[PDB]
Amino acid sequence: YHGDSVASLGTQPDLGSALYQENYKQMKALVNQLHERVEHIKLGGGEKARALHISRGKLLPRERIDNLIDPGSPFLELSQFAGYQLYDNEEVPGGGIITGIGRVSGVECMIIANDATVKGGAYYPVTVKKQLRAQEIAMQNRLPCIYLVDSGGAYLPRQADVFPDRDHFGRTFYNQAIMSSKNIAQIAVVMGSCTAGGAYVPAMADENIIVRKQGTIFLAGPPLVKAATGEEVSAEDLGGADLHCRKSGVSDHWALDDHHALHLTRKVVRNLNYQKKLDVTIEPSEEPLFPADELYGIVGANLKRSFDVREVIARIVDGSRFTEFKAFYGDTLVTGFARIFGYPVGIVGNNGVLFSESAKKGTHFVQLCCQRNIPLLFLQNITGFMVGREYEAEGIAKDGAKMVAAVACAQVPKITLIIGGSYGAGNYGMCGRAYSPRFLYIWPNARISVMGGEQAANVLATITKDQRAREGKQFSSADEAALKEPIIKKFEEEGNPYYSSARVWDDGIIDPADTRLVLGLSFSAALNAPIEKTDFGIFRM
Amino acid sequence: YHGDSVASLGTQPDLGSALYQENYKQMKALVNQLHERVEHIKLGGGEKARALHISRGKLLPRERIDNLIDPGSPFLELSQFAGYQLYDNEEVPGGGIITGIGRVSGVECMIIANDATVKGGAYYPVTVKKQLRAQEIAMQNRLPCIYLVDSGGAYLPRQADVFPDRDHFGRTFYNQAIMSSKNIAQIAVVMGSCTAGGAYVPAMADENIIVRKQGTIFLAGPPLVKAATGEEVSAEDLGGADLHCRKSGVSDHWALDDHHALHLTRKVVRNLNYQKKLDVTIEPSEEPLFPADELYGIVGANLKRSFDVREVIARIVDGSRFTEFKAFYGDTLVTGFARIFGYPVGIVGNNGVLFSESAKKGTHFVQLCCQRNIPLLFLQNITGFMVGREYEAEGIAKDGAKMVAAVACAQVPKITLIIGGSYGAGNYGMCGRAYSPRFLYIWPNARISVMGGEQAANVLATITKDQRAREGKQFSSADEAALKEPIIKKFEEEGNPYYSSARVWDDGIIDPADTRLVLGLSFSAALNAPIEKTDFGIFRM
Amino acid sequence: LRQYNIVGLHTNIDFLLNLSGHPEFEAGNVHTDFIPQHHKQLLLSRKAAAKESLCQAALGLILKEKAMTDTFTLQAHDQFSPFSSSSGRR
Numbered sequence A, B: 001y002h003g004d005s006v007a008s009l010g011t012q013p014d015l016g017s018a019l020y021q022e023n024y025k026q027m028k029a030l031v032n033q034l035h036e037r038v039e040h041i042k043l044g045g046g047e048k049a050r051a052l053h054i055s056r057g058k059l060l061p062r063e064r065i066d067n068l069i070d071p072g073s074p075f076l077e078l079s080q081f082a083g084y085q086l087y088d089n090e091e092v093p094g095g096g097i098i099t100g101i102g103r104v105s106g107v108e109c110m111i112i113a114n115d116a117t118v119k120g121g122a123y124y125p126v127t128v129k130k131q132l133r134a135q136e137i138a139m140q141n142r143l144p145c146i147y148l149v150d151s152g153g154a155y156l157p158r159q160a161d162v163f164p165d166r167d168h169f170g171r172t173f174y175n176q177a178i179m180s181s182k183n184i185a186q187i188a189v190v191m192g193s194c195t196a197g198g199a200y201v202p203a204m205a206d207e208n209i210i211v212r213k214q215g216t217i218f219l220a221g222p223p224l225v226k227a228a229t230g231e232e233v234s235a236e237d238l239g240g241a242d243l244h245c246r247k248s249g250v251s252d253h254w255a256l257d258d259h260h261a262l263h264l265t266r267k268v269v270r271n272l273n274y275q276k277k278l279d280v281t282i283e284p285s286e287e288p289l290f291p292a293d294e295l296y297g298i299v300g301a302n303l304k305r306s307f308d309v310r311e312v313i314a315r316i317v318d319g320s321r322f323t324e325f326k327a328f329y330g331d332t333l334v335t336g337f338a339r340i341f342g343y344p345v346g347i348v349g350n351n352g353v354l355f356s357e358s359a360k361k362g363t364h365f366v367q368l369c370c371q372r373n374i375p376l377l378f379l380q381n382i383t384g385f386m387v388g389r390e391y392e393a394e395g396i397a398k399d400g401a402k403m404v405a406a407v408a409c410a411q412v413p414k415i416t417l418i419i420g421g422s423y424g425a426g427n428y429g430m431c432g433r434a435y436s437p438r439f440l441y442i443w444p445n446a447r448i449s450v451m452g453g454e455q456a457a458n459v460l461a462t463i464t465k466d467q468r469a470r471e472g473k474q475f476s477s478a479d480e481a482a483l484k485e486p487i488i489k490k491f492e493e494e495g496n497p498y499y500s501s502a503r504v505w506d507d508g509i510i511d512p513a514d515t516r517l518v519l520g521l522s523f524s525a526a527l528n529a530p531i532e533k534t535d536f537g538i539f540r541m
Numbered sequence C: 001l002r003q004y005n006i007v008g009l010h011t012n013i014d015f016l017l018n019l020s021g022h023p024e025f026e027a028g029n030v031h032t033d034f035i036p037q038h039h040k041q042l043l044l045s046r047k048a049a050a051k052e053s054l055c056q057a058a059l060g061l062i063l064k065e066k067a068m069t070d071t072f073t074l075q076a077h078d079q080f081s082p083f084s085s086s087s088g089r090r
């Protein structure tokens, strides 16, 4: 029996209020800025590179994905801003690689396509990190991996940051071998040249497809062959679909053109003999009772002002229905049960400074979700931990550690959304990047750093005021901002969402109006893997 | 293909026959006696206690259950007669506690509610036993436990029978901890005062709900606080929803009144993320081909007369369809396959004195059901084992033991119904209380004891006739009934169904016309737990 | 007119039924002051409902709950459970 009437969250905001008008205007500008920057990244290398790419009969990388996925299906792209201003004078739109989750033949798959228009598809250090992140997502959720291979090899000027280390280019083949051993299909589509390590990708795949003339697979390229043995051979003769398809045997399928190869890929996925099974209970979906775009006015762009996280929850959960847990205890933290697109979810969101009661309340809640195998969603808007002599005497650190330890051991799928600040140990307790959430997203107004910019400035303003008061040479107020202004600028620049997203610290910057859709797609993908039993460590009582 | 026509059990009784008329009249009187006694127990403590209970704004205990379970759903109450005349001068209707199985939010749950109108909710020795029996049922069938806590603590005058032993009050918290470790949800609803051990129940629960002003939780009550420290504090200040909800943190949900708390409880169960799965094959249900009330005439109240157990079977199984196993071998025992409300069941019922062939036939049948994971139903109407020099020489004890040993090790759900006598070792072979049947019910005409009253009388009439014949002082016939009449009275009084049910030896006395419904509800609840593989001991061939 | 039914807004259906009921209209003595002259008769206050009608409404809530129970049963694996009955029997 599910006919019981229940209360719903959310309240109608005052659209006429000046605060709402200002907050909407500021957030809208950030979203517009985000949209137009993505439009530029959409163009990849540029008109000249794109014209050259098409002149060879090859499809553009994003057109390949459009044709690969099911007609009209949504595509969840990841880390669109990787490499954004990362390198001083080189522009690398999207890191030279496009990764995302889409539906192929009714199966959710991870798609990893090299962007040949960007630096000829060379692998920059960020390119390796983006690919490794995609492989990690695919393995944790048992998503088949499809590699649209069109690459130019490693970027020699930065080889030390690509080749040697554990998380360097070598790890890519290690991940392929491990996923294959777990029956997570690895499909490679050679739609271009692949050289040196690139040739290993088709070789390490379970099933492989190569285009008739564009594709080439050589461990040593023609330039190396000539230098080593003084022989002149074309790339097609050294590699090519015909040689590998008919003589070398490296090719499992032979494709006439890009369209044919994509059609073959869809057939390969259909033969995986895989059917999705859900471990969680399901209920019919319902839209939230409030418009999502109102989040612009409610949240704004000023992190100093505070808002009720329940308002954010009311606009993303099915029917704006929410069962709060321990509502009046540790009120700075909000925990409760809801449903997104029919899936059950336990939501943990910050509503102020973390206290001992808040940490205890969170630790209790996380155990409940793990016991019932309920996915967890974290909404990070932190401002730090309570600071005080009494709080330390009562083991706030001991309480805060309780939550870091429960969150780490939880085996239910975890998704983190940074809707505000993320500073210090508060990041760890709220399932930061270091704690392996299945996905991590940030809003365009977020800030992340070891501590807030002001705190670092004020702290230094104590150390050197002390330095010269205790030493005895006086240190004046103008000497204070020759100390504080450079610090605040640095933390503002390095805490910017684009700075965080340019490096792969999050999986993307998302428009707040799209929060519900992104969460729905992410949780749906995460449910492809069975939920395991959670084993906890010692709870330091 | 299930279109085969099959034979059906049952025959039309001779309604005009004098035996049927007499048997119907006697059984009807017993049922009417049972009904009116339950009506009195329904009233609990009485009008004055009930008026006082309502005057405090609290719902009556049975009204709480009505509001908790799904609208219109049946409620299977257990041990309604616990404490019936158990204590010399104290009336304890239902033992001061109401236990049963009902559907909450579409999930079968065990509900344990203290009856505050009975002795202020104090825990009598029978009260602990009734609660422990309910917890045992919930654990064996994986039923979530809901505690409607309104208690006054242990009954001090009888503390030695409540506190110390393994099956005493302490075991209640042990059961809660064990079920929680197995993911069997424990939900406590504090709708009144709970003191000393009572305060542990909300603390030991996975999720907890407390009413605004009625509920109070404290390890030490105000009276103990004053004696120990000489401080005067009200119960609300010492405990109360506000203190635990907001400061102590013992409370997970805060409720305005009894209605609000019950509404919250339904929400909590809906978030358990549980879905029932059946291990057995299912077929469409069908009503029996004969009226159930005819069981009154067929069975009667005279245990000396015998009836065909097949007649009882024909009036409870779907379509009165029954496949008998080894019909002509060991005919004193009836075994076969049937279906009740679509569930498959193997039925074992007595049709006379147990013989070596009957025990062997039963042992063979029980192995069949365990192999196929088929629930077992036992219909006990026993009169003893075959007595004879030849039978002992042929190992009747060896044969009888074969059945005791197979029945004990069987892991399929087992339900026992005593429709007649239950004496001696015949009780053990037919899955008595000692053999952990999931449920045990008795008809109002049943008798249970170590042996029949007459046998004990006759046996003594041999021992003392011998005592004085062998000693030499003559012992006359009038001396015989000064021996026999007290024995027969004792066994009649202690074998009465109310005597057996007042103590928790069975789960209730049920009207024969309700047998099919009770079995259907019981088997449905027992299927919430997966059926395990059966491991047998050594069969002494 | 009595079978014309509207829920969610106010309507003149009740006034029309009262006007058709009025005896003068049935006679055919119609004049354009009919509504002002018979204004008190045409607009009439609600009367208290009979206990019978209240019984029907109670049955309607009970039967609607039974339908809701039936809907859940169709989704459930245990379709034939005795608990899914709406018998309300102890």
Ligand SMILES: O=CCCCC[C@@H]1SC[C@@H]2NC(=O)N[C@@H]21
Binding pocket: A220, A224, A227, A228, A229
């Ligand atoms: O060292 C200079 C270039 C020509 C010699 C390099 C040799 S060829 C055999 C071996 N394989 C390589 O890739 N490099 C060395």
Ligand SMILES: O=CCCCC[C@@H]1SC[C@@H]2NC(=O)N[C@@H]21
Binding pocket: B220, B224, B227, B228, B229
């Ligand atoms: O013994 C007489 C009553 C007052 C003293 C009892 C003390 S108070 C501390 C401790 N806790 C109890 O419940 N009883 C003892």
